[PDB]
Every structure is written in structure tokens, then in C-alpha cells.
Amino acid sequence: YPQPKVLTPCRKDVLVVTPWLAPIVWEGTFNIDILNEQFRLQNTTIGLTVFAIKKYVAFLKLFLETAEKHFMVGHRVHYYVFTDQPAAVPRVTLGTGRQLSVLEVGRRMEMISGCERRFLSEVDYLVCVDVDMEFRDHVGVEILTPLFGTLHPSFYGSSREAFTYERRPQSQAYIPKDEGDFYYMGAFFGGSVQEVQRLTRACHQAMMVDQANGIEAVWHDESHLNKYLLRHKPTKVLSPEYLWDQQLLGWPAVLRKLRFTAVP
Amino acid sequence: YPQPKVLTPCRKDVLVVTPWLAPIVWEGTFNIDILNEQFRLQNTTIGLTVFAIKKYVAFLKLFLETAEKHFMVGHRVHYYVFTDQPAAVPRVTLGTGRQLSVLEVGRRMEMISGCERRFLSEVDYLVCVDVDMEFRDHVGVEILTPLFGTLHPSFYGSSREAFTYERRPQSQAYIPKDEGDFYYMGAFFGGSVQEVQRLTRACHQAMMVDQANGIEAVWHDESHLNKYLLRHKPTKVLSPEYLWDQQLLGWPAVLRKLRFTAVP
Ligand SMILES: O=c1ccn([C@@H]2O[C@H](COP(=O)(O)OP(=O)(O)O)[C@@H](O)[C@H]2O)c(=O)[nH]1
Ligand SMILES: O=c1ccn([C@@H]2O[C@H](COP(=O)(O)OP(=O)(O)O)[C@@H](O)[C@H]2O)c(=O)[nH]1
Numbered sequence: 125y126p127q128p129k130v131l132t133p134c135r136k137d138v139l140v141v142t143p144w145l146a147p148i149v150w151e152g153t154f155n156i157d158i159l160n161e162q163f164r165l166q167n168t169t170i171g172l173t174v175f176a177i178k179k180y181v182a183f184l185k186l187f188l189e190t191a192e193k194h195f196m197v198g199h200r201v202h203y204y205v206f207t208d209q210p211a212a213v214p215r216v217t218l219g220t221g222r223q224l225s226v227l228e229v230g231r232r233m234e235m236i237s238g239c240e241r242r243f244l245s246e247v248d249y250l251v252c253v254d255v256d257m258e259f260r261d262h263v264g265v266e267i268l269t270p271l272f273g274t275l276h277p278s279f280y281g282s283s284r285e286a287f288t289y290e291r292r293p294q295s296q297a298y299i300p301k302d303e304g305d306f307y308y309m310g311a312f313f314g315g316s317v318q319e320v321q322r323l324t325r326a327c328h329q330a331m332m333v334d335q336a337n338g339i340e341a342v343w344h345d346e347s348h349l350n351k352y353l354l355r356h357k358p359t360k361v362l363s364p365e366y367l368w369d370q371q372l373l374g375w376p377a378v379l380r381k382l383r384f385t386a387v388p
Numbered sequence: 389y390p391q392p393k394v395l396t397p398c399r400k401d402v403l404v405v406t407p408w409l410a411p412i413v414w415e416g417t418f419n420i421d422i423l424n425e426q427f428r429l430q431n432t433t434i435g436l437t438v439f440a441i442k443k444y445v446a447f448l449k450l451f452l453e454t455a456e457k458h459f460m461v462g463h464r465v466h467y468y469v470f471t472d473q474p475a476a477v478p479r480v481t482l483g484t485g486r487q488l489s490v491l492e493v494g495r496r497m498e499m500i501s502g503c504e505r506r507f508l509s510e511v512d513y514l515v516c517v518d519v520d521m522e523f524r525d526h527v528g529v530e531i532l533t534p535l536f537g538t539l540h541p542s543f544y545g546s547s548r549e550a551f552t553y554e555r556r557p558q559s560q561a562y563i564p565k566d567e568g569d570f571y572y573m574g575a576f577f578g579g580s581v582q583e584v585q586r587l588t589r590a591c592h593q594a595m596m597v598d599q600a601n602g603i604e605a606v607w608h609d610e611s612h613l614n615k616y617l618l619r620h621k622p623t624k625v626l627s628p629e630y631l632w633d634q635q636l637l638g639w640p641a642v643l644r645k646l647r648f649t650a651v652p
């Protein structure tokens with residue numbers, strides 16, 4: 125493969141590492157051939173969780189079809205579809221080493237943390253995404269790490285005081301005006317099974333505390349996710365390539381690939 | 389602390405992450421206040437190993453004095469001094485939480501891997517350096533990770549075919565002319581106790597295989613270190629700030645700090 129050269133950076137236009145030395149994942153920062161080999165040597169299995177409740181079942185077909193084309197191809201994958209309509213889950217043909225389970229539900233942080241023993245035995249990593257999305261380009265093992273969050277596409281150019289963090293100190297999700305690294309979106313986070321269960325257990329415990337206190341955070345689980353990732357910093361951060369809306373935000377030059385996008 | 393901004397990189401002049409998404413540690417890439425807190429929450433202990441055999445005992449005083457000023461200050465540190473002259477080890481006054489053991493020896497990879505149970509109980513990380521050096525600036529927890537190597541200061545601007553890897557396929561250290569990421573120096577490597585014992589055990593086993601075969605690698609343990617770190621890629625790479633010789637190479641602009649340097 126091409127020899128990396130220490131005096132020529134590959135991307136000079138964007139921050140590629142956080143101040144706590146976590147990679148920020150942009151096209152041009154990674155050689156996928158190297159990463160794929162490292163992960164295949166461990167026989168890595170990746171869990172992908174998706175909720176499709178009520179009308180949101182309609183999003184599953186495209187979601188799964190497109191995951192088959194772009195998500196962890198070559199690796200073992202277990203889709204977990206949480207739904208109130210198990211008969212509405214479309215039958216999508218999967219690649220080898222890939223499987224899907226339908227979990228019937230009667231919330232997300234709760235539901236993710238007691239499927240607890242199940243995830244620990246079956247997968248190495250867990251990835252938690254919104255269903256009303258499609259994959260348009262490669263989303264692979266470059267994202268895998270103990271704990272990651274994703275930069276919210278509306279706020280990646282913003283200063284922290286503009287971040288729509290929870291601001292009432294009454295709320296467990298509270299983050300002061302002069303604190304904060306990034307604004308992460310709740311639509312795409314993950315990590316090791318152990319780290320995702322810690323995060324979701326913490327968010328769940330914090331939401332219950334707010335509830336028993338008569339307050340709900342301004343952006344609900346996304347508020348608590350941001351407070352967690354402030355105090356427990358992610359080991360990788362995904363760039364907005366991994367969570368975008370072309371309709372609302374177009375295709376700027378700084379995004380070489382649009383990998384996982386909102387469905388119009 | 390200052391808010392990192394995703395569209396303004398802190399260093400645009402150098403590569404700050406490897407193609408396998410390991411940070412390359414340069415001044416300006418890390419907020420030490422954040423790192424120090426993360427490491428202190430774990431009560432981290434760092435082991436530092438140094439060989440001082442024959443005339444090399446003369447280097448210890450400056451080495452230790454300067455480590456006290458610059459190496460992991462605020463953290464727990466255990467110096468391990470391997471020497472054939474235990475009475476020649478200077479008595480240097482240490483900061484709180486810091487200790488030194490003198491290990492008498494009658495090689496390095498061997499000696500590091502059977503002090504094996506001893507390191508596993510006493511430290512979390514191990515750092516292995518040459519003694520004829522001095523610390524001139526901060527060398528701290530930014531370097532800590534499962535496995536790291538350091539860019540050789542003579543070869544960081546070089547193409548791979550110029551790297552003085554072992555080139556005879558007769559040798560276990562053999563690396564083909566079209567392979568290779570970097571040229572790491574043997575003078576400064578480390579990692580978790582488990583990873584450093586794996587590396588040193590592998591290098592030791594590989595050296596014995598070459599010996600039983602009548603061949604010694606061109607640069608001896610540094611050759612085997614480079615072959616190991618090719619096949620087991622480091623989780624961080626230290627920039628030349630961490631291993632320099634001002635006499636031979638000066639002080640280029642791209643080095644904002646000269647942290648650990650050869651003694652003239
Ligand atoms: O009626 C609903 C509401 C929410 N969701 C799940 O939770 C996510 C977020 O819901 P919301 O509509 O508030 O956010 P959106 O996805 O529209 O940005 C959805 O993607 C689904 O994955 C669902 O399945 N059914
Ligand atoms: O007589 C010796 C030779 C080597 N060394 C140890 O192994 C390192 C490398 O030895 P060499 O002189 O070959 O390399 P140098 O340090 O001069 O670059 C030294 O720093 C010491 O830490 C030693 O202690 N005594």
C-alpha cells in the first residue's frame with residue numbers, strides 16, 4: 125500500500141484527531157485494507173440495532189437493503205430489529221455471515237440495556253442508529269472502537285454556546301455554557317458491547333432521575349448522550365460523512381463521501 | 389478549555405494519524421489537562437526501564453534527574469534500572485509516588501520479558517528507553533496506549549526503500565523492499581505490560597531463531613522491533629519530538645518541542 129509520509133498530511137482541511145487523541149473519521153484518514161485485515165483476524169461480529177415502531181416499519185426495506193450493500197461488508201453482522209409489528213419486517217436477502225433477529229416490543233436506551241446478556245454473547249460491537257436512513261457509501265470497521273459518537277451535521281461548524289445541550293441545572297443532562305467538546309447526534313453511536321451497555325444504562329438511569337423530578341431534557345436521549353460523552357470521552361468520533369441530510373445541507377466540498385443519510 | 393473546531397485543524401503541517409487510525413503524537417494535538425485527568429482517575433502507574441551496563445552507568449544521574457523534572461509528573465512512576473554495577477546507581481531524590489528499583493544483571497528483550505510477573509503486578513504501562521539521553525521537555529500520559537513505537541529521527545522524511553530494515557530473507561527480521569509503514573527506533577517503545585511482554589517475547593524468540601541460523605539482523609533488536617510493529621501495528625506512534633539529537637539534526641520548525649534527546 126501507499127507509504128504514509130509524516131510531513132505530508134492526507135487531510136489538512138479538517139481536524140482528524142480530538143484533543144484527547146481520538147481519531148475523527150474522515151475519508152482519506154484510513155486505509156481500509158489494513159483495518160479490514162486487523163478486524164477479520166479477530167473474527168469480529170458487529171451488532172446493528174434499529175427501532176421500527178408504528179409507521180417507521182416502512183423505512184426498514186431500504187435501510188436493510190442498503191446496509192447489505194455498504195455496512196461492514198465482509199464481516200459478520202447481526203441486525204437487531206426492535207418492532208411492534210414483527211409481521212411487517214421485510215424479508216431481505218442477506219450476504220453470508222449476516223443475520224437478522226426481530227425483537228418484539230410493547231425506551232431505546234432502556235430497550236438496548238435488558239437485551240443485556242443477549243448482546244454480550246452474540247456480538248463484539250454494537251452500533252445503534254435511526255431507521256429512517258439509508259446507506260449510500262462505505263460504513264465499515266474504521267468506526268469500530270470502545271466508544272464512539274457522531275458529529276451532528278447541523279452543528280459541526282458551531283461554537284459551543286450555540287450547542288443545544290440541556291441547559292437547566294435541574295436536569296441530569298445539564299452541561300454549563302462554557303463546557304463541551306462537540307455536539308453528538310443521538311442517531312448514530314456505538315462501541316464495544318460493554319461500553320454501549322454502560323452508556324445506555326447511564327442514560328436510562330439519568331432519564332429516570334429527570335422523570336421522577338418533573339423535567340424532560342430538551343432533546344431527550346440525545347441530551348443525556350451528550351452529557352455522557354462529555355464525561356466519558358469517545359475513543360473515536362465519526363465525521364458528518366456518517367450522518368447527513370443532503371436535502372437540508374447539500375454536498376459540501378469538505379464531505380468527500382455521503383455514507384449514511386436521511387431519507388427525504 | 390479551548391473548544392476543538394472540526395474545520396480548523398491544529399497541525400496542518402504534519403500527519404497526525406496513521407492509516408490505521410493511530411494517533412501520531414505531536415505538540416498541538418493533545419490537551420494534557422484532559423489526558424492527565426483520564427489517567428489519574430485510573431490511578432495509573434508507569435514503569436520506566438533503562439539498562440546501564442559498564443560505562444553507561446555514568447549516564448544515570450542526568451537521566452534520572454531529568455526524568456524527575458519531565459517524565460509523567462503527577463503520576464505514579466517506577467523506574468527499573470538494570471545494571472551490572474548496583475553500587476554505581478546514583479541516589480537521586482524522587483517526587484512523591486515515584487520509586488526506583490535496581491536490578492542486577494550478569495539481552496534487553498530477554499531481560500525485559502523474565503522480569504515478567506514482577507512488571508504485571510507493579511505497573512500498568514511499561515516504557516523502554518536508552519540511558520544515554522536526557523529529558524528536556526514534557527513526556528507524559530499522551531504517549532500511553534496498548535502499544536507504541538517512536539519514529540527514528542534520521543528517517544521520518546524518508547521513503548521506505550531507504551529504511552534500514554533487515555533485507556536478507558534468511559533473517560526473521562526480514563521486511564521486503566515494498567513493505568513498511570515507518571522506521572521506528574529501538575531507543576523508545578512501550579505500551580501496556582501485556583503488550584510489551586508480547587513484543588519483547590516475540591523479538592527474543594526471533595533473535596534466537598536468527599542466532600541458531602548464523603545470522604544477526606543488521607540493526608539487531610531494532611530490526612526485530614520493526615518487523616514486529618509492521619505485523620502488529622502500534623496504537624500510537626510518537627513523533628520525533630520524543631527521540632532527537634540536536635547536535636546531529638538541529639532544531640527544525642516542525643519540532644515545536646525537543647522532549648527526549650541524545651546526550652552530546
Ligand atoms: O413512532 C416512532 C418514533 C420513533 N422511532 C424510532 O426512534 C427514531 C427517532 O424518532 P424521531 O422521529 O423523534 O426522530 P427522527 O428519526 O425523525 O429524526 C426513529 O428513527 C426510529 O428509529 C420509531 O421507530 N417510531
Ligand atoms: O555497554 C553497553 C552497551 C549498551 N547499553 C544499553 O543499550 C543501549 C544501546 O547501546 P548502543 O551504544 O549500541 O546504542 P546507543 O545508546 O549508543 O545509541 C544503551 O543506551 C544502554 O541503554 C549499556 O547499558 N551498556
Ligand SMILES: OC[C@H]1O[C@@H](O)[C@H](O)[C@@H](O)[C@H]1O
Binds near residue numbers: 278288
Ligand atoms: O438541536 C438538536 C436537534 O437538531 C435537529 O436538527 C434535529 O432534527 C433534531 O433531531 C435534534 O438533533
Ligand SMILES: OC[C@H]1O[C@@H](O)[C@H](O)[C@@H](O)[C@H]1O
Binds near residue numbers: 552607
Ligand atoms: O539506520 C539505523 C541506525 O541509525 C543510526 O542513526 C543510529 O545511530 C543507529 O542506532 C540505528 O538506529
